[PDB]
Design a protein around this ligand. Structure first.
Ligand SMILES: CCC(CC)(c1ccc(/C=C/C(O)(C(F)(F)F)C(F)(F)F)c(C)c1)c1ccc(-c2ccc(CC(=O)O)c(F)c2)c(C)c1
Length: 250
């Protein structure tokens, strides 16, 4: 059965698309305002050398801190998000931040050479750039695999904005107080996404693949948290981060 999208579901999609268009820059025009990327010789991928230099950390921390601010703005526009207590809103944003960033970064990701391409060679990011920020292969290798699998879904922008919203409004995040309200908000979004796929996505299982990507994001989130903790132990690391990054991941 292929029910039509209701007037409410149409309204939810239009709000999320408008929210995304106002909070995501496909021209990466603010990147010149971040602390500059610095790339040093690290062919071997030496953990000791990367931790001693963290050459790409100020730039990548700025990239993530900037994206968190945009995610905060996007979330405020999600239907029902403002009905939650401020406490539940902050818990949801903090716990989903890196996951949402991983979804948002897919637009700049290219399979032509397996990089996030955001302009000239300066704003072109590969596996080596993430390792230069103090992260290790247990995160970056499944991260590239995630980016490819996600890119291959060829998501409509409507499905992309619904997936980010569903990711943020998750009742199974630790520290949430009103899980039932969060679940009702998420179910309204999930039903919108499911209805949308069934009547707008042409042939040739997409919904189940999108749900699996959400489970993949949980694994990546946990590994990122473990890696951020190691990184935070490096002396003088806090100056290479930002106050927002310190709060969200600390
Ligand atoms: C460089 C790869 C990646 C992939 C998701 C990334 C960037 C930083 C970190 C790691 C972060 C940190 O752990 C750090 F700094 F400590 F090492 C922490 F989370 F704590 F900050 C990680 C794992 C991945 C990234 C993120 C956002 C954008 C990206 C794409 C597009 C846009 C434009 C827009 O959103 O409007 C954008 F701002 C950013 C781009 C192009 C790449």
């Amino acid at each position: 059965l292929r029910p039509k999208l209701s007037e409410e579901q149409q309204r939810i999609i239009a709000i999320l698309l408008d929210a995304h268009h106002k909070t995501y820059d496909p021209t990466y025009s603010d990147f010149c305002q971040f602390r500059p990327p610095v790339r040093v010789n690290d062919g071997g991928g030496s953990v000791t050398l990367e931790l001693s230099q963290l050459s790409m950390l100020p730039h990548l921390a700025d990239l993530v801190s900037y994206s968190i601010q945009k995610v905060i703005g996007f979330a405020k526009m999600i239907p029902g998000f403002r009905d939650l207590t401020s406490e539940d809103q902050i818990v949801l944003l903090k716990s989903s931040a890196i996951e949402v960033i991983m979804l948002r970064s897919n637009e700049s990701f290219t399979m032509d050479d397996m990089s996030w391409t955001c302009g000239n060679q300066d704003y072109k990011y590969r596996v080596s750039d993430v390792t230069k920020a103090g992260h290790s292969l247990e995160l970056i290798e499944p991260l590239i695999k995630f980016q490819v699998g996600l890119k291959k879904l060829n998501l409509h922008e409507e499905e992309h904005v619904l997936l980010m919203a569903i990711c943020i409004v998750s009742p199974d995040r630790p520290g949430v107080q009103d899980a039932a309200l969060i679940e009702a908000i998420q179910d309204r979004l999930s039903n919108t996404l499911q209805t949308y796929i069934r009547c707008r996505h042409p042939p040739p299982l997409l919904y189940a693949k999108m749900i699996q990507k959400l489970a993949d994001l949980r694994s990546l989130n946990e590994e990122h948290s473990k890696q951020y903790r190691c990184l935070s132990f490096q002396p003088e690391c806090s100056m290479k981060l930002t106050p927002l990054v310190l709060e969200v991941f600390g």
